[PDB]
Design a protein around this ligand. Structure first.
Ligand code: HEM
Ligand code: HEM
Ligand SMILES: Cc1cc(N)nc(CCc2cc(CCN)cc(F)c2F)c1
Ligand SMILES: Cc1cc(N)nc(CCc2cc(CCN)cc(F)c2F)c1
Ligand SMILES: C[C@H](O)[C@H](O)[C@H]1CNc2nc(N)[nH]c(=O)c2N1
Ligand SMILES: C[C@H](O)[C@H](O)[C@H]1CNc2nc(N)[nH]c(=O)c2N1
Ligand SMILES: [Cl-]
Ligand SMILES: [Cl-]
Ligand SMILES: [Gd]
Ligand SMILES: [Gd]
Ligand SMILES: [Zn+2]
Lengths: 401, 402
């Protein structure tokens, strides 16, 4: 009843004992597997107990002293208020642990080096904006990116909620026309039309950095223009394909997810923007080449004079590899931290070994860990993985409308 | 009723067919084991049989008809009398085709209805088994115009051993454990190679030595059978523009013919039912040739291409891999051997999914096996969510009979 997990490259076997702790249930049954699907009062005490018990085992402080103490304060805090506040070190530990537990994240070898800004004493979107702006400039750090999460006030009943309406802190606009097709990023068409609805002058171009829509409790969202010198971007060029620069492609330096809901010890923070640095395939494969994204694949292939007339020339494969090469090269020349999918997945294999010794396994979503190009050329492809929900966690949440 | 989105188009369907998944796999609400390579009594034989006959009679527009209950009645009487029952031939052809239709890890299922079923259930020995097999290889190879085929050897039955083909495929390359602990040839085939040797095969010492067949008649030791070289159509590998690539000496064979899986139809088990189609180029170019635990040529090709193999950010692995795949497609087209690239194959599979959504209300699909091992998000199946489940009839894995 402890899943046997095999690696088919080496032949090594481990058992995932950690899967036994799975709190929230995922989408699969003995009947059918939905692993490939993207989006599958005082029990607050039970989650808060366990998280505090985690915290203290993590500091070699199980069964002693402040463990028992802090158990009481949360007991009394919830008893009196129907909720509780996290000790600063726990909000930090919960942030680091939710990252550690993100099955779909391949960069979790870095989970232990995360900078937590505590924005829990926030009030008004004007405040978030400078909280977000500090994060952005801290995380960006002139291109030497540093993992950062800003945690805005936890949710409480009767009162509203802090939300960033954008999926990320940096998003490119997407506009329809007298023919429907999108100039710019089609993934952001909707938040782009929202930003315009809330009175933003639309740009003309394919890489217009959207403005932020920030939402203090029970107040309508407020447009915020991001300081352009705060938004570090990388114009894309290719080392040997001199014409690639002429395609005018750019991406931003900072992958900063601003629509997910941090959950620690039963507390839900609907606004907790976390950021790290990009793996190159995210930009060069998914963002630029997905058919419903910038969809530049055939354009690059035209410019490389590839045989787009037959699938078997592998023109798609060839052009995609060069786009990724241009992403990597451009980011490295701009001295912006980026990691290629080979380095990233090799570090994740190291992570799995760490976690096997540390916690006896690791929740990992195979479909999202394996890169979107050259999958079987990365060692994670040949690694069986167990996917399950551990707490604390980053969770998906409804669009705040 | 699982809702299933296509992220490239925005499509949404609900897989009503998953509710019919009888046998059960490895996942729970607690944890997903989707990525596991090997997930997994007269009355129960009766209900599998009953369901399959229901299926067969559905397919012939005769559900609930006279002949339907007669067959139901017949099967129960025969399970009562013999403990088992015999498929009619039209049922066997249907069950072989459904088994393919139901195989969740087959991206080539658009072709599931075009399948040549050879009825070898009268097979009597290993020697007759070999002859049926040679004719399978001959028919399917078809001088490089490959045709999908399956040969069904006698079903498992009380009193007698199983027919087994010990080889995992009809065409395998020898893998010799070396002097210095390495492998010469295909490392995936060390075990079967060792077995062949033990059973009297005089080994070679090349990298592409075609294996003899170990063929097991019931209650018999396996028997060694060499394949006539002229029956085994191979493809020397060259690259359309890298001319040094032909000097690698690389080959692959034309016919992918899986021979160690069990065919299950209405509760009956055929532990020997080899089946064959044609390759997708990634199976050869990416997996067979570049897997570190296989031929592992990626670095030697990238070195020959003068790629910068000292840094991973140069994407030398991706680049060498793509030209190995190019080489495979070119070489098979040049040799006039049927081959489908992963873009064509995944696009035809998208049509399979649509046909299957109209026909049955969904399609069992193992996303991690359907999505090709290079250029995954470049193919449409990447952005298609899928519901993986087990339908019968089915091809199942089975333990190696040694
Ligand atoms: C520092 C380097 C990091 C790298 C290279 C990295 C890489 C990735 C990649 C490639 C994904 C794929 C999921 C997708 O494409 O949507 C992912 C998912 C994810 N990562 Fe990481 N990440 C990093 C840092 C972080 C940090 C700091 C956090 C949180 C504290 C985090 C939390 C997550 C979460 C929640 C997901 C799932 C998001 C989703 O499924 O949409 N990551 N990561
Ligand atoms: C005609 C062209 C065909 C194509 C292009 C094709 C393609 C594929 C591919 C690429 C895989 C994954 C293989 C792997 O990585 O292990 C696969 C799996 C499979 N195919 Fe098909 N196939 C074809 C014909 C057939 C036929 C005729 C049958 C049976 C009647 C069949 C049954 C299966 C089964 C059972 C699997 C899963 C077994 C396994 O791969 O572990 N296929 N197919
Ligand atoms: C911190 C971080 C670093 C990184 N390198 N990458 C990510 C994932 C970014 C992301 C992308 C998409 C696009 C569709 N997958 C959806 C998300 F929800 C999401 F968080 C997050
Ligand atoms: C009929 C058929 C056609 C085709 N084009 N391909 C196959 C798959 C061959 C195969 C390969 C491997 C290697 C590891 N995946 C394991 C299997 F179980 C298997 F059946 C079968
Ligand atoms: C349907 C399929 O599961 C979906 O497209 C997933 C697959 N794997 C992924 N992996 C990453 N990293 N990002 C994604 O958006 C997806 N999409
Ligand atoms: C461990 C992992 O499941 C394993 O490497 C799988 C992944 N997906 C695959 N998909 C296909 N088509 N063929 C394979 O051999 C594999 N191998
Ligand atoms: Cl992104
Ligand atoms: Cl193969
Ligand atoms: Gd030109
Ligand atoms: Gd040349
Ligand atoms: Zn599952």
């Amino acid at each position: 009843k402890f899943p046997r997990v095999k690696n088919w490259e080496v032949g090594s076997i481990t058992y995932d004992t950690l899967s036994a702790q799975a709190q929230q249930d995922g989408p699969c049954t003995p009947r059918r597997c939905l692993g490939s699907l993207v989006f599958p009062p005082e029990q607050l005490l039970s989650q808060a107990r366990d998280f505090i018990n985690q915290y203290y085992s993590s500091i070699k402080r199980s069964g002693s002293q402040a463990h028992e103490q802090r158990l009481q304060e949360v007991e009394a805090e919830v008893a009196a208020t129907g909720t509780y506040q996290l000790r600063e070190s726990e909000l930090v530990f919960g942030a680091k642990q939710a990252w550690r537990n993100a099955p779909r994240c391949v960069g979790r070898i870095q989970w232990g080096k995360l900078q937590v800004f505590d924005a829990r004493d926030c009030r008004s979107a004007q405040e978030m904006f400078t909280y977000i702006c500090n994060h952005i400039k801290y995380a960006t750090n002139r291109g030497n990116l540093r993992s950062a999460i800003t945690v805005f006030p936890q949710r409480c009943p009767g009162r509203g909620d802090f939300r960033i309406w954008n999926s990320q802190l940096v998003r490119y606009a997407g506009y329809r026309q007298q023919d429907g097709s999108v100039r710019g990023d089609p993934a952001n068409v909707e938040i782009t039309e929202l930003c315009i609805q809330h009175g933003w002058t639309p740009g003309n171009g394919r890489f217009d950095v959207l403005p932020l829509l920030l939402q203090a409790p029970d107040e309508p969202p407020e447009l915020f223009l991001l300081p352009p010198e705060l938004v570090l971007e990388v114009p894309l060029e290719h080392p040997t394909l001199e014409w690639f620069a002429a395609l005018g492609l750019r991406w931003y330096a900072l992958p900063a997810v601003s629509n997910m809901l941090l959950e620690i010890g039963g507390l839900e923070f609907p606004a907790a923007p976390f950021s790290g640095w990009y793996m190159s395939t995210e930009i060069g494969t998914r963002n630029l080449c997905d058919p419903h994204r910038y969809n530049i694949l055939e354009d690059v292939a035209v410019c490389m004079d590839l045989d787009t007339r037959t699938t078997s020339s592998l023109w798609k494969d060839k052009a995609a590899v060069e786009i990724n090469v241009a992403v990597l090269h451009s980011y490295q020349l701009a001295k912006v931290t980026i990691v290629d999918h080979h380095a990233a997945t090799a570090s994740f294999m190291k992570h799995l070994e760490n976690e096997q010794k540390a916690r006896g396994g690791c929740p990992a979503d195979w479909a999202w860990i394996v890169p979107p190009i050259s999958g079987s050329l990365t060692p994670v492809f040949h690694q069986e993985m167990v996917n399950y929900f551990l707490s604390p966690a980053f969770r998906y949440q409804p669009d705040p409308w």
